[PDB]
Curated annotation (Swiss-Prot):
Converts 2-succinylbenzoate (OSB) to 2-succinylbenzoyl-CoA (OSB-CoA). It comes from Escherichia coli (strain K12). It comes from the Bacteria. Belongs to the ATP-dependent AMP-binding enzyme family. MenE subfamily. Its EC number is 6.2.1.26. It catalyses: 2-succinylbenzoate + ATP + CoA = 2-succinylbenzoyl-CoA + AMP + diphosphate. Pfam families: AMP-binding, AMP-binding_C. Keywords: ATP-binding, Ligase, Menaquinone biosynthesis, Nucleotide-binding. This is 2-succinylbenzoate--CoA ligase. Gene3D superfamilies: 3.30.300.30, N-terminal domain of ligase-like. It is an enzyme of class 6 (ligase). HAMAP family: MenE.
Amino acid sequence: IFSDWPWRHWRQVRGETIALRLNDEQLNWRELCARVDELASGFAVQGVVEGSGVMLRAWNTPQTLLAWLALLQCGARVLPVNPQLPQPLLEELLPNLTLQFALVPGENTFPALTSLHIQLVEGAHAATWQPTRLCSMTLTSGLPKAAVHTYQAHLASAQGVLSLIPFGDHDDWLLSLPLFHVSGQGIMWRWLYAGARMTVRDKQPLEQMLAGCTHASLVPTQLWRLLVNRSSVSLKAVLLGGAAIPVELTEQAREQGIRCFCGYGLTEFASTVCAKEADLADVGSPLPGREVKIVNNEVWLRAASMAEGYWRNGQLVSLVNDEGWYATRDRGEMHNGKLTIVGRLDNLFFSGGEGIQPEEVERVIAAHPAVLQVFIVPVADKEFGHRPVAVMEYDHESVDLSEWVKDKLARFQQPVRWLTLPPELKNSRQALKEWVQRQ
Ligand SMILES: Nc1ncnc2c1ncn2[C@@H]1O[C@H](COc2cccc(CCC(=O)c3ccccc3C(=O)O)c2)[C@@H](O)[C@H]1O
């Protein structure tokens, strides 16, 4: 790509085409640039300049979306913040993130930040469009880190997604996931990348939120919610992510006429890295722009959507390792161009002198049709350091698998105890470890 602010590009190309539904109010691009203009001008009178660090603490609402466009058009570095993050955690994070303003349309409670207010004044206040300008700072989720992205990176993310998921002139993506996550940002950038339509509507049941839309992004529990309510859903495409996506979910969805795409994404990549139409264990081959490789069982990623760095103690620190890749801490395998996530390196533990990857042992056991869930959890052992324990939820009554595993797992991977998953953990690896150490 764009030679001007995305919303102004489409204003010139297709100005009278409808761009946005905000609570059922329809705005074409010309009208949209006009509302953003009023807010961007109001922010500038209150001190927001190119590079200002601004906390946007809020849930998705039409105001929040407009405020984002306005803040960005001023050239600000936007840190959207989940209103549920507690004040003590923010008191720890904020002073290191080089912020001067807070917009909470709640109350600002951080007196080092000047309180911003939605204010309509006259003007077309805009910083000059610059794809390489810093756009956002998204919290990862120890202390959250602030992954920083340029406009260019969000646009590269969008380009890749839209190479898999057709999204065109008439289509309409619901802003279905929070803008304080990369998921909701990705929807906004896909909308703007394509110059299509987005819908933003104050909170109502998801079934109603979806009215008139063609596309949505869901976490798996949102999709389950729709299926259990037997909601009528009429979509071209749903993109799922945030976790592994069970085959049963997508089969149940397919039966309701819901075309699902499954993605592997990360905060550091401003959303989706690998993706596929729902079909197999893998997370699909890398989206165009992205590259994947496995080193010493670790998934490494490279893309134009990668964050410029993490904002540390007032400065930008690069994400990349000595080869120019991001080391994910995810354990993976590549077969036939497709990535499979085996587990998290943070869960690996040692028993004797062997590495037990819980997720691998879990997969083997879970294939037993009596088994609905299995977690493999270390417990302290003098002779061997740790030994695996199975914590199980069975389909009906429990079954003895202590023999059935002996030809499917090596000795060091076989559980030394088989326990039952308690109600307090149905619908956390530390919690399971802690619970097992009291059993
Ligand atoms: N498809 C997978 N298989 C298996 N493990 C996975 C996994 N997707 C993550 N994960 C795991 O969960 C970890 C972190 O996952 C995320 C954390 C923060 C942000 C995100 C991106 C979420 C996302 O961007 C999104 C969510 C809902 C709907 C659409 C989208 C989207 O726009 O792409 C993922 C990964 O490192 C993996 O260990």
